[PDB]
Design a binder for these strands. Sequence first.
RNA 1: ACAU
DNA 2: CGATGT
Length: 136
Amino acid sequence: EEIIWESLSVDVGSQGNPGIVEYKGVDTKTGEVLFEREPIPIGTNNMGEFLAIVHGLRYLKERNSRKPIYSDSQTAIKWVKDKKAKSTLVRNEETALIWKLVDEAEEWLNTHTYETPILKWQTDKWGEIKADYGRA
RNA sequence: ACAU
DNA sequence: CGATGT
Ligand SMILES: [Cl-]
Ligand SMILES: [Cl-]
Ligand SMILES: [Cl-]
Ligand SMILES: [Mg+2]
Ligand SMILES: [Mg+2]
Ligand SMILES: [Rb+]
Ligand SMILES: [Rb+]
Ligand SMILES: [Rb+]
C-alpha cells in the first residue's frame, strides 16, 4: 500500500543470465549506496537477488538496525524465508565462486537470528526499486 | 500466470 | 527475443 521509506532496498545487476553478477544495497529514502558486491564471474539473477538480501540482513544486524529490506524478487524472498536457495545453476569449476557465496549465505541464515521484515517492492505501482541498475 |  | 525462478 505505502512505501516504507525507512528501509534498505537491494537489487542484482547482471551481464547475461547466467552471467556476471553484482548486487548493491541502498537507503530507500535517499538512494545512498550502502554496500556493493564485487562482480562475480558467473551466477544467476536469482542467486544474486538472494545474496543481496542476505547481505542486507547481515549489514543491518551488525549496525543494530531494525529497518526492513525491500526486494523485487519473489524468488529470492522465498529462498530467504526457506533458508534455501533452490537454484538450477550447474555446480562446476566456473560456478564455484557464486555457489560458495550461496552456501555461505545459507550457513549464516542457519546460525543467526534476525527480525528484519523482508518486503516485496511493488514495481508495478512504485516504479523500479531504488537499488536498480539501469540495465534491464 | 506471477515475479525477475 | 533469451534465461532464472514459484
Ligand atoms: Cl555474498
Ligand atoms: Cl516493516
Ligand atoms: Cl514475495
Ligand atoms: Mg531485482
Ligand atoms: Mg533491477
Ligand atoms: Rb548486533
Ligand atoms: Rb536494470
Ligand atoms: Rb518463464
